[PDB]
Amino acid sequence: MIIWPSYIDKKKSRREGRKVPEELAIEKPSLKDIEKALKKLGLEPKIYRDKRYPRQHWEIAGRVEVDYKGNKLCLLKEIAKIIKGKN
RNA sequence: GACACUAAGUUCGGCAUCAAUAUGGUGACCUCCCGGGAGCGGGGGACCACCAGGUUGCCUAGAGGGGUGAACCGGCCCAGGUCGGAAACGGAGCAGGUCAAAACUCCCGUGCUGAUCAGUAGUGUC
Numbered sequence: 001m002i003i004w005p006s007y008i009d010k011k012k013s014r015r016e017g018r019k020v021p022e023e024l025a026i027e028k029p030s031l032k033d034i035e036k037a038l039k040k041l042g043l044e045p046k047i048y049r050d051k052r053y054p055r056q057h058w059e060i061a062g063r064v065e066v067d068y069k070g071n072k073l074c075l076l077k078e079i080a081k082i083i084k085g086k087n
Numbered sequence: 088g089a090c091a092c093u094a095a096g097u098u099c100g101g102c103a104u105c106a107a108u109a110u111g112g113u114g115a116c117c118u119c120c121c122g123g124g125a126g127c128g129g130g131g132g133a134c135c136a137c138c139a140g141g142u143u144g145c146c147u148a149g150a151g152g153g154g155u156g157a158a159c160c161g162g163c164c165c166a167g168g169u170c171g172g173a174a175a176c177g178g179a180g181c182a183g184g185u186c187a188a189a190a191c192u193c194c195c196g197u198g199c200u201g202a203u204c205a206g207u208a209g210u211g212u213c
């Protein structure tokens with residue numbers, strides 16, 4: 001499973017990446033936040049710093065990868081909820 | 088005879104060339120879900136344009152015909168580059184073309200109004 005950071009960015013529109021609802025989208029998603037949340041779910045992430053979402057080719061913001069096999073969306077919503085449980 | 092008004096009859100300008108509303112199609116921006124290995128695929132929501140269009144009736148007045156570039160926004164095609172991919176291909180945006188539409192123009196038609204002619208049509212006036 002491939003998790004492009006754009007999938008959870010609150011600053012990005014739907015057509016620009018966002019796969020997660022507005023109420024769950026994260027302010028500044030980072031590969032660590034995604035790696036940490038994924039590790040909190042008992043999974044094993046794999047960060048790839050050099051790789052760019054085609055909808056933002058100019059921007060080199062990595063991408064993580066996990067073996068997970070469930071609802072990609074569910075997983076994403078869940079990693080969004082983890083990232084904010086204490087301001 | 089004379090003067091009015093009521094049309095119309097010339098001769099030249101000035102302009103206008105529907106408004107108000109349902110249903111349907113398409114499309115950007117936005118939003119939500121379902122699906123997929125990545126790029127992506129699919130369905131819904133709202134809104135605002137536009138193309139079709141049933142109904143309704145006032146504004147000096149189930150109706151047209153061309154055209155152009157180009158404030159801006161959009162379709163479509165399609166480079167180079169670039170990104171995802173083993174590849175097929177898919178993406179973000181440009182240059183390029185192209186269409187639609189904003190817009191502005193020309194034409195025909197129907198009229199309104201201004202002046203100019205003459206003064207026949209009709210009831211008035213003295």
Ligand code: MMC
Nearest residue numbers: 070074075078
């Ligand atoms: C993991 Hg949902």
Ligand SMILES: [Mg+2]
Nearest residue numbers: 021022023118
């Ligand atoms: Mg909301």
Ligand SMILES: [Mg+2]
Nearest residue numbers: 028029030033
């Ligand atoms: Mg943070």
Ligand SMILES: [Mg+2]
Nearest residue numbers: 015127128129
């Ligand atoms: Mg789609």
Ligand SMILES: [Mg+2]
Nearest residue numbers: 136137188189
């Ligand atoms: Mg129009």
Ligand SMILES: [Mg+2]
Nearest residue numbers: 138139140149
């Ligand atoms: Mg028609």
Ligand SMILES: [Mg+2]
Nearest residue numbers: 141142143149
């Ligand atoms: Mg009718």
Ligand SMILES: [Mg+2]
Nearest residue numbers: 103146147148
């Ligand atoms: Mg009028």
Ligand SMILES: [Mg+2]
Nearest residue numbers: 105145146148
């Ligand atoms: Mg009228």
Ligand SMILES: [Mg+2]
Nearest residue numbers: 147148199200
């Ligand atoms: Mg009149």
Ligand SMILES: [Mg+2]
Nearest residue numbers: 139140141149
């Ligand atoms: Mg009709």
Ligand SMILES: [Mg+2]
Nearest residue numbers: 115160161180
């Ligand atoms: Mg655009």
Ligand SMILES: [Mg+2]
Nearest residue numbers: 166167168169
């Ligand atoms: Mg190319």
Ligand SMILES: [Mg+2]
Nearest residue numbers: 165166167181
């Ligand atoms: Mg191209």
Ligand SMILES: [Mg+2]
Nearest residue numbers: 165175176177
């Ligand atoms: Mg093809």
Ligand SMILES: [Mg+2]
Nearest residue numbers: 177178179180
């Ligand atoms: Mg494209």
